[PDB]
Amino acid sequence: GEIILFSGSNHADFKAWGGDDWPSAFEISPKYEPMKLDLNKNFEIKVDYNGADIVLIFARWDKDIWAQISPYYVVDGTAVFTKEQIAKAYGSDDFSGLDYIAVKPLPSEEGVTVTKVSGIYTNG
Ligand SMILES: OC[C@H]1O[C@@H](O)[C@H](O)[C@@H](O)[C@@H]1O[C@@H]1O[C@H](CO[C@H]2OC[C@@H](O)[C@H](O)[C@H]2O)[C@@H](O[C@@H]2O[C@H](CO[C@H]3OC[C@@H](O)[C@H](O)[C@H]3O)[C@@H](O[C@@H]3O[C@H](CO[C@H]4OC[C@@H](O)[C@H](O)[C@H]4O)[C@@H](O)[C@H](O)[C@H]3O)[C@H](O)[C@H]2O)[C@H](O)[C@H]1O
Secondary structure (H helix, E strand, O other), X not given: OOEEEEEEEXXXXXXXXXXXXXXXXXXXXXXXXXXXXXXXXXXXXXXXXXXXXXXXXXXXXXXXXXXXXXXXXXXXXXXXXXXXXXXXHHOOOOOOOOOEEEEEEOOOOOOEEEEEEEEEEOOO
16 A cells, blocks of 8 residues: 556557457566565555556466456546455465466457556455
């Protein structure tokens, strides 16, 4: 409360599925990139975005998981994803082996722009 993980403009264009790549407006490989946020903490993730709807992805390649979730809610161009959601989609709240974290847009006419991403710690 509060750990800034990104700021400034990032536009992503995405028309539909079934192509080559599904691009991200923001993404981390936590096995190689150092990361501020503590996953074992009880947390939420807030994203300031504009335009198309969005999803948050937590993925592990070797066990082949693709936890992908919608916002808990959205207010004033700010979405909110909780840990309860992520863990439920992931199958567990133990993220050892985690390969990939990303904010991705759904198929839209004219894409999305992310202005900021952050994390917050909570009192369970
Ligand atoms: O293990 C290989 C691994 O190596 C890494 O080095 C590499 O970077 C990884 O990309 C790669 O893993 C594969 O990633 C691709 C693409 O992932 C993106 O993010 C990672 C970036 O590196 C990369 O640049 C990006 O392109 C994944 O493909 C996507 O998979 C998701 C979800 O997983 C699907 O397949 C596995 C199965 O268990 C899931 O249930 C299934 O959903 C798909 O997202 C879903 O899309 C559907 C629409 O489906 C469409 O499929 C094909 C299309 O022709 C047809 O029209 C549609 O049916 C929506 O309904 C869902 O909302 C959504 O969840 C993407 O469509 C798909 O591109 C690979 O899964 C992964 O192996």
